[PDB]
Amino acid sequence: NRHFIDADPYPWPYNGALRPDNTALIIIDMQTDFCGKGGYVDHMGYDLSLVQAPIEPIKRVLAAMRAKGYHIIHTREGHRPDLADLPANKRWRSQRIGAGIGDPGPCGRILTRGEPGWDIIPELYPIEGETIIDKPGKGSFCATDLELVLNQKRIENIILTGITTDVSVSTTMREANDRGYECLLLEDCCGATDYGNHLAAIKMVKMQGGVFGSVSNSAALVEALP
Amino acid sequence: RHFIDADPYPWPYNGALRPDNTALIIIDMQTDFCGKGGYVDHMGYDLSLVQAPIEPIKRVLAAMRAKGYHIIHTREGHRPDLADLPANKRWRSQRIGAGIGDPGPCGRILTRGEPGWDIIPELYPIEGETIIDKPGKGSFCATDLELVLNQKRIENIILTGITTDVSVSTTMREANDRGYECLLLEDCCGATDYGNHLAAIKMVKMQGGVFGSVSNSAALVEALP
Amino acid sequence: NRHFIDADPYPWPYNGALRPDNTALIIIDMQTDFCGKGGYVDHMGYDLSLVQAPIEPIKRVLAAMRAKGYHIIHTREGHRPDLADLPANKRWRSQRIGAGIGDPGPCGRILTRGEPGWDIIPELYPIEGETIIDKPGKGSFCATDLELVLNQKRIENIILTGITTDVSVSTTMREANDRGYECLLLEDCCGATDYGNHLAAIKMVKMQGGVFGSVSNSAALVEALP
Amino acid sequence: NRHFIDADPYPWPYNGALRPDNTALIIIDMQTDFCGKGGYVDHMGYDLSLVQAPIEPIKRVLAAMRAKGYHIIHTREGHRPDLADLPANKRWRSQRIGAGIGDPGPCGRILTRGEPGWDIIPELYPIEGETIIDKPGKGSFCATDLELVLNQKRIENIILTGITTDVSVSTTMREANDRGYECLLLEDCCGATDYGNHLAAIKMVKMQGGVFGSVSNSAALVEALP
Ligand SMILES: [Ca+2]
Ligand SMILES: [Ca+2]
Ligand SMILES: [Ca+2]
């Protein structure tokens, strides 16, 4: 009963065991803070078009995987309003460059849970029955219930999308891969603060016969999704 | 306070740099990753890229040993029974002719107890230095690294070893997510692809030091308290 | 600069480093589901007076530690409304005995986040600046951000209270102790579904020169708290 | 194609999905330090017959599960020779009662990796293909690769044996249960420093319709093992 997605450096998933019941899409940190005007990334002066580029491709993948009954997971990087989960170094770095986590901005308190800027963008909003992971780090496994959730659902395969490619997306992929999950990175469904770093994070997956998994794109996924 | 000249900010961020709260970690300087006959060699990558950091790590190691800093070493590898080896990881390595567990000139590839898997003689651990044996790229995943760091009350980590974009970068991300303050020494790491090495380094610097800061062996040795 | 609380089998904390900045009270799972009429524990037919007994002693410890600026942590065992974090075995066991997690009861859906029965009882309600851990298991470290929070605050010492003694309280103490935290169990500030199991969980702490930490009571803590 | 083991409070595993490929025996900390003369437990003056009693029953369960191709896991509590993984409180407690971890005794350095006293006893020694977990705490999940190993092998069911019942065995069971694993405690295959604490740890499993899993014995397991 095998099915593959055309991918680089190998057809994904490795063993062809691609089904709705054992496969999840994860949409990482598609929040106003990371891709919208007035947010954290905007405050740092990075080019929002790099991180907005993946919105429509993720939209297409999301629609297709919803229609076929695949597990859908969303993440939000953010902190408790009391900032108890905010490392001192992380906070200081963000303040030094004028984008202080917890400080007020046009979208509310930066990367603070419950604030408008922190929420997932309307274009990729979750619907009921889709798990949201609230995380205080870049990696989606660190200090969350993601592993527990994945194991209860018996998820083996993860399709990664979202932003930023080299930070949250890459870290989540590394975490997942280290724990035995089989991951596909959709290159047109991520974007970064630096386009070269985006391309490099993608190439890093491919080395050593697919060290972190494999790489494809939104069109190829939609085409071959069972 | 004490600082090391680093990019994008002088490290550590708060100047709290002492022997008692700072560790060097030497990641995966094993024959499998940088020596002839090992895993990386089997894949056809250029061993000089991964051998380049040996002498600079040696200098940092000697200095930090002399000043009583905590020293940690890692080894990526698997139990002889391969119970800790994900099926996908194994399959990928077999597909490209460098199968984990399969026999080669240095023994079974990335298998604990085999010659190829051990730390190279140049950077061998001495008594009192903790070795982390890990089944993944990240040094926190499925190990006691966090426990060890917390018992010693380590706040600052200086990262060296190979490969820059795989084990080193993953370990840095893990550490940083948990609140550790990390310095990557750019001349003390190397990768399978030199551009990926440079990119992993540049990734640290974004957003005012998203994963920590970056320096080099000479600058560290010169300013180490 | 050392301070100790009279405890068994050794004066706590072991090294006398007892300060507001490095010490937290944790109040475990003082929810209607575990000690109130109509909840999970009531449904199973256990004697609510055993689990209600610790309310006033915890109240006294809470008031004292708040007044002296100690870190205060609360926990709630519970599940996401979609039950993504609910193991199949856990759910099945609870249904078999007529107290099914997620099923409707007089206080709402049993052990389901957002429901009246699941919330912390009014007597021990959190105030702003006190961290609440929402956990899908008995142990407060499993699949939560508790460790991350404790480490950012540099907490070394934990004073444990709440219910039930042999389940969530004991599991949390074991987790904390394994990771190097120095724990004090307040015996009059916990209670269980079986009084002998309560006493036994307490005695287990004391073996081997304090294998899990040490044991005291609410009066002794209040009297000697710096 | 369901199979059950006669157990209390419910026939185990809960869903009858009992197979060699998804079930592991874990033999916890059957080391000279915990059950042999000259070791840690002996130094504390506890009665070695309590902790030796389970040896022959574990032997029978081990032989049967080996013969039927079940996954076999062993654990060893212990510390690196440099004691980097040894919490200061844990060490201090052990020194206070004259059984200091790392200190020299008749079996070598107490609970120190590489020492004779620390190794698994010859009667229950591992054979090739059987995973050994080296752990610095009582819980077998804390700071180890146990979860990773279990997930790669797709283990759902765990049969727990070893010592001590109320410390390492119970903590491991709680950890496993919190993460969704289905656990059976074999009551004649464990023993403790206090026989009443042993019985209490066992009874704790049974509350609330099997809060931590279920309880059986070596004979019942061997007789019904598929
Ligand atoms: Ca060499
Ligand atoms: Ca930290
Ligand atoms: Ca600690």
Author numbering:
A (entry chain D), C (entry chain G), D (entry chain H): 8 to 233
B (entry chain C): 9 to 233
From the paper:
In the Cys175Ser variant, biuret has an extensive hydrogen bond network with both sidechains and the protein backbone: Asp36, Lys145, Thr171, Ser175 and Gln215 have sidechain interactions; Ile170 and Thr171 contribute hydrogen bonds from backbone atoms. The active site Gln215 is provided by from the adjacent monomer of the dimer, which protrudes into the active site of its neighbouring monomer and binds the terminal amide that is distal from the nucleophile. The pocket is further constrained by Phe41, Tyr47 and Val174, with sidechain atoms of these residues between 3.2 and 3.9 Å away from the biuret molecule. The amide oxygen closest to the nucleophile, which forms the oxyanion during catalysis, occupies a pocket that is formed by the main-chain nitrogens of Cys175 and Thr171. Comparing simulations of the Cys175Ser mutant and the wild type revealed that Ser175 adopted a number of conformations that placed the nucleophilic oxygen an Ångstrom further from the appropriate atom in the substrate when compared to the wild-type. Combined with the relatively higher pKa of serine, these results help explain why the mutant tightly binds biuret, but does not catalyze its hydrolysis.
Herein, we have described and characterized the structure and catalytic mechanism of BiuH, a cysteine hydrolase that hydrolytically deaminates biuret during cyanuric acid catabolism by R. leguminosarum bv. viciae 3841. BiuH is structurally and mechanistically different from the ‘canonical’ AtzE from Pseudomonas sp. strain ADP, which fulfils the same physiological role; i.e., it liberates a nitrogen atom from the triazine ring and allows further degradation to make all three nitrogen atoms bioavailable. The protein is a tetramer (consistent with SEC); each monomer adopts a five-stranded parallel β-sheet which is surrounded by α-helices. Helices α2, α4 and α5 (residues 95–102, 178–186, and 202–213, respectively) make symmetric interactions to another protomer in the tetramer, forming a dimer, as part of the basis of the quaternary structure.
